[PDB]
């Protein structure tokens, strides 16, 4: 019951670019917006979600601990306090904990970029949402919906049960 | 008409990790192995695309050209000239050609990897073949087959046909 479509940048056959298609994806929910992402730097996204939030949507967004104050860096520059829109929960995730050879303890990254909207369409793949993936990079994603959309439900509340209320606040 | 299973590392309730995953589908190839990969480092992972190799399998692997002496330093520490390897055809890939804040030259990254193997089955996702994303780092894949895997048959072929001769040969 799944189907899947492919985007890539720069664009190939398909009428709209990777980015207009996240915009679309989230002008079009409706209840609830769910963010797996490793980098978050684009300010026309952000704004988007922001919108989301205001008519109501519930909006929640892991971010890689390590990458964390560049999310931060850009909201303040855009004059927004995020921490207050009580719509959206921003929270971090770290990769695994290992010691290096001089013996301190550091931990990985989290290696996961998707895009869940009302728990029936999905964006996966190695798009980042920051301008190296618009002028820089080649990168793809798939589009999902059916029945694969519940496994990725899932992976979002095991991630959200690991992630932590970021130290910044 | 698409079937997709999902694998995590570290591993949740499959019995597999990725890397035995990776593996398990190289010892399988009986025709043809195409890797599109951003770094390459792993001695394990390399082992077993040679050993396929000297069975008979043609193998053309594509990798990201920021990155391509990584690669080749491992082959050279592990004592082989992967240049005389006839059955395997190593090239790379640049992202899009840009211009810096300063007015520099630079090429974006080749953000893309999955194994193929006998155009029947793909692993794609977010893991990448060095000991980081074994020992460091979350991630997870796919395993596709069905009419999709036709989709990333034709985007290697698209790869091929953009990527170079390594500049370090």
Chains 1, 2 share one sequence.
């Not at 004059?79 to 929270?91: E, K, M, P």
């Not at 793949?125 to 694969?148: C, D, N, P, R």
Request: glycine share 4%; with cysteine.
């Amino acid at each position: 019951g799944t189907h899947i479509d492919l985007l890539f940048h720069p664009p190939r056959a398909h009428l709209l670019t990777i980015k207009e298609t996240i915009r679309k994806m989230i002008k079009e929910a409706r209840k609830v917006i769910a963010l797996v992402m490793d980098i978050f730097t684009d300010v026309d996204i952000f704004k988007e979600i922001v919108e989301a939030s205001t008519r109501g949507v519930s909006v929640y967004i892991l971010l890689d601990e390590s990458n964390f104050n560049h999310f931060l860096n850009m909201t303040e520059k855009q004059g927004c306090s995020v921490q207050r829109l009580r719509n959206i929960r921003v929270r971090t995730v770290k990769g695994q904990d290992y010691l290096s050879k001089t013996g301190a303890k550091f931990h990985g990254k989290m290696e996961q970029k998707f895009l869940l909207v009302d728990c029936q369409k999905v964006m996966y793949g190695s798009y980042s949402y920051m301008w190296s993936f618009e002028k820089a990079h080649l990168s793809m994603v798939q589009i999902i919906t059916g029945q694969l959309v519940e496994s990725f439900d899932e992976e979002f509340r095991t991630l959200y049960a690991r992630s932590c209320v970021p130290s910044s606040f």
